Ligand binder design. Structure first.
Ligand code: HEM
Ligand code: HEM
Ligand SMILES: Oc1ccc(Cl)cc1Cl
Ligand SMILES: Oc1ccc(Cl)cc1Cl
Lengths: 137, 137
């Protein structure tokens, strides 16, 4: 289930963080505009860039903590406030987050592993609602 | 305290994992004999090798799972048994583990972050005692 999925992802975190972020960026090419330096690069080139590896790992490290602190796939309101108050997320909307979780769930469904994709879909929806309550447009 | 420390360490897992492993290896040079692929290389050389970062991340991730499952800094006997039974740990003794935790506590005290170094010291002592009870020499 959901809790075991967190353990699975953490056990190969750099690989999953990069694979999932790349799936997001290739499913939604417009989202690359939020990173500027990622345009015109293939996946293998991105994976060789310092800020790409460091950044995807930090995103995923924190995403797994938020997932781990949730109850029944509902994140804590304090974790949602943190994500909203981050300077780096000024200019983001909940739509950016919704798209991340659509790609993550699709990636899980296609991997052939025993992920509880339905719990991740609920988690993403519940996170987006929490982000709005915390003030994100 | 202990639980926040786990969150702090997990938030930047690869960076802490590398720095703590290097602190251990440089404090206890003889221990590097267990890691024949890392002999003859400076800290910066090791950090440039993908296999070093991957190895340290996987170890440290499991250490944080064990710490998170502990009650009052006492690890679960099942987690201690897992560590004893791993093939990669054939030939190790509790002494190797004690030295790791000395280096880890020394790293925390020196870092100038508000780690609960006393709790990591207790955790390391209780883990060493649990490894004995699970069959490690
Ligand atoms: C649960 C979901 C997310 C979490 C936990 C998260 C977490 C983080 C963290 C920890 C950082 C700073 C790490 C660093 O030092 O590089 C960061 C930066 C950033 N994140 Fe988020 N993030 C999430 C979702 C998103 C989404 C959906 C977008 C855009 C579609 C996004 C865009 C960015 C950008 C542009 C930066 C800074 C870029 C440079 O630096 N993040 N995020
Ligand atoms: C609580 C502490 C520890 C945990 C959680 C842990 C866990 C692990 C894990 C998950 C691996 C496999 C990582 C990989 O795939 O490369 C591993 C491998 C290994 N560990 Fe441990 N370990 C711990 C302590 C130690 C200590 C103290 C030593 C020796 C001083 C040690 C020696 C080794 C060796 C030699 C390998 C094989 C590495 C290789 O073949 O490249 N471990 N350990
Ligand atoms: O910016 C990111 C880095 C890693 C992951 Cl998994 C998702 C996002 Cl949006
Ligand atoms: O082999 C290791 C990798 C990372 C850390 Cl923190 C400790 C050890 Cl023994």
């Amino acid at each position: 289930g959901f809790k075991q999925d967190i353990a699975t992802l953490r056990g190969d975190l750099r690989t999953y963080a990069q694979d999932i972020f790349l799936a997001f960026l290739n499913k939604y090419p417009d989202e690359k505009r939020n990173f500027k330096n990622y345009v015109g690069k293939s996946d293998q080139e991105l994976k060789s860039m310092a800020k790409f590896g460091d950044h995807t790992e930090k995103v995923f490290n924190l995403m797994m903590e938020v997932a781990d602190r949730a109850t029944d796939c509902v994140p804590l309101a304090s974790d949602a406030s943190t994500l909203v108050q981050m300077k780096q997320h000024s200019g983001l909307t909940t739509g950016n987050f919704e798209k991340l979780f659509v790609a993550l769930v699709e990636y899980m469904r296609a991997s052939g592993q025993s992920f509880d994709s339905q719990s991740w879909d609920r988690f993403g929806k519940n996170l987006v609602s929490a982000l709005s309550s915390a003030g994100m447009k």
